[PDB]
Amino acid sequence: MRLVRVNIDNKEIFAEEGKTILEVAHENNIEIPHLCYDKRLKPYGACGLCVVEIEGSPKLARACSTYVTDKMVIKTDSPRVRNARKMALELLLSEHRGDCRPPCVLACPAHTDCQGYV
């Protein structure tokens, strides 16, 4: 094995080889959004929320599939990444039919959890 030297959000990390960017960021307290990622399953790539900007690469790389290499500079909150995630979330919401909070909660000026205590 070899310890790879990466840089995630201007923080130098000494990660282990054969690890995805998602695992490295999880074990180093860096938050990367993900919706279609599970540890027990092979990568899927559907949601496209875990996109991170890697220096030297033109396209945003999925953190759930890309493996950390040596001398890797990863930006997980750059404006390009934020715009990509925001567009993905808007597209997901465009086909969403739900109610995060009931109208009773929203009508209350104090926003008391009316459904909850009822």
Binding site: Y44, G45, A46, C47, G48, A84, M87, A88
Partner: protein, 527 residues
């Protein structure tokens, strides 16, 4: 005399079957023993049904042949030994001008031989590249020959083929495959259907050379089940080749073994993708998987596979027999060789054209295509298919090349250039192809599954005039986000029309949305 009839899918619907039946009946009536054989499309689809009479080396083609005109042909040329010249359109003395500006490598034997006869391909120099590879060659030399020849792409991808062959042969594993991408998802492009129906043995020879160069022992051809004539011709060719020991185990009394099985896709645009093709062959739905694990390193069932188009496989034997240097002398410095296009739309003479790379689009449209129908102004070309772009009138001089076409936004794609005049409205065209791509998405990733639909409704609102403000900026942002966020190539190339129509024809959209009318007067809701 040797009678040949265009029996390709093109001729079939045109009436080639009835022409062949009538000419056989006429020869029976006049007790004449003349070999009547089928042949594939020669590129002049508009002249079909076609009958070619061969004497010695000369060939005479009768355009728009009809059963009632068969007896005249028999009594003039077959019986009287005198060309009619009243219905003959082209001959060996003077080829049709549409065929004088084309160089033909993939379609060199498409329409001049008998597809259901191995000996006809053999007598035309066929299966000599395979012999030269088998005896005085080594797989590394085959990789080197393909690399020198500069062959690449031909499925619209544009990736070097030698790199894929090297990656497949160097990859770990003792079992490797060789697949052929014959699933023409774009309706309007039939290059490889025509190649399979007309000259199916170049595909087999290229696949065999690729297997030798890679180290494969099994082969697959992914042909759509909607091509029955292509499947029949391929099965006949495979059986005949196995008869001559040109396929199967122990090819030409060597240790080399290679066999080909035929896979029939149910029919889906996305199933043409490499990874979706692999999933469909494996027996699952055609959902493209992630690319960085590549088919050259992990394809069908985890073993390395080499997936190539029909055209590159057809170009391989010519490369081997004539050498890499001869192939590399055709085309630009970036793109070597020749490319096949399916001219259609408002062009004067549609059909298949094999042109050298770097030949200007204006030359193809005017000199080869014959100009615009009814001599109207030429507005744009929808190059690449439903995932291509609208190259405008002023960019008519961009040379045919992967880099030169892509620099204009469009893609080589399925080589289907849809010629359009000033009558056509750009918003409807962009909405037309985007609708097709949205219907053909597989639905895995959010950007392609729902983003394309949002773009389609935005375009519909624009065309109906009911579009709100901010529609152009929102549409452009949606298109660039779908293009840069989608997983597979069906989503990354999905908004190519819109984007292109927003780079050259932004004023059309602006007049559509603000003035609530279109200059082209084609939108039904606005006329």
């Amino acid at each position: 005399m040797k009678i040949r009839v265009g029996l390709g899918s093109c001729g079939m619907a045109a009436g080639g079957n009835k022409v062949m039946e009538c000419i056989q009946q006429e020869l029976r009536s006049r007790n004449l023993d003349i070999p009547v054989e089928p042949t594939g499309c020669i590129g002049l689809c508009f002249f079909e049904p076609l009958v070619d009479v061969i004497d010695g080396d000369d060939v005479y083609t009768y355009g728009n042949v009809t059963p009632e005109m068969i007896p005249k042909i028999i009594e003039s040329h077959v019986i009287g030994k005198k060309p009619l010249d009243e219905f003959i359109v082209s001959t060996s003395f003077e080829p049709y001008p549409m065929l004088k500006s084309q160089v033909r490598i993939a379609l060199k034997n498409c329409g001049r031989i008998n597809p259901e006869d191995i000996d006809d391909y053999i007598k035309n120099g066929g299966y000599e590249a395979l012999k030269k590879v088998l005896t005085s060659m080594t797989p590394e030399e085959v990789i080197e020959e393909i690399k020198i020849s500069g062959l690449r792409g031909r499925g619209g991808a544009g990736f070097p083929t030698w790199f894929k062959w090297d990656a497949a042969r160097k990859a770990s594993g003792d079992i490797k495959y060789v697949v052929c991408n014959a699933d023409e998802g774009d309706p309007g492009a039939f290059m490889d259907r025509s190649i399979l129906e007309g000259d199916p043995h170049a595909v087999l020879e290229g696949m065999t050379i690729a297997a030798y160069a890679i180290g494969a022992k099994e082969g697959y051809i992914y042909v759509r089940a909607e091509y029955p004539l292509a499947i029949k011709r391929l099965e006949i060719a495979i059986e005949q080749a196995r008869n001559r020991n040109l396929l199967g185990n122990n090819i030409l009394n060597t240790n080399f073994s290679f066999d080909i099985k035929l896979k029939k896709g149910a029919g889906a645009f996305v199933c043409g993708e490499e990874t979706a093709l692999i999933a469909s062959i494996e027996g699952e739905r055609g959902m493209p998987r992630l690319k960085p694990p590549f088919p050259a390193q992990s394809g069908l069932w985890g073993r390395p596979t080499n997936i190539n188009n029909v055209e590159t496989y057809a170009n391989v034997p010519w490369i081997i027999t004539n050498g890499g240097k001869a192939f590399a002398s055709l085309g630009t410095e970036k793109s070597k060789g020749t490319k096949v296009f399916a001219l259609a739309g408002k062009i004067k003479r549609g059909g298949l054209v094999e042109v050298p790379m770097g030949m200007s689009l204006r030359e193809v449209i005017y000199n080869i295509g014959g100009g615009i129908k009814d001599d109207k102004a030429f507005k744009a070309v929808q190059m690449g298919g439903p995932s291509g772009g609208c190259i405008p009138a002023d960019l008519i001089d961009t040379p045919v090349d992967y880099e030169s076409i892509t620099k204009t936004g469009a893609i080589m794609g399925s080589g289907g250039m849809i010629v359009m005049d000033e009558t056509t409205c750009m918003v409807d065209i962009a909405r037309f192809f985007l609708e097709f791509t949205c219907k053909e998405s597989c639905g895995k990733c959010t950007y392609c599954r729902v983003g394309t639909r949002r773009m389609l409704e935005i375009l519909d609102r624009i065309c109906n005039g009911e579009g709100r403000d901010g529609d152009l900026e929102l549409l452009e942002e949606l298109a660039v986000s779908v293009k840069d966020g989608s997983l597979c190539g069906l989503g990354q190339t999905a908004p190519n029309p819109v984007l292109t129509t927003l780079r050259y024809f932004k004023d059309e959209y602006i007049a559509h949305i603000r003035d609530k009318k279109c200059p082209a007067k084609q939108c039904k809701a606005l006329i």
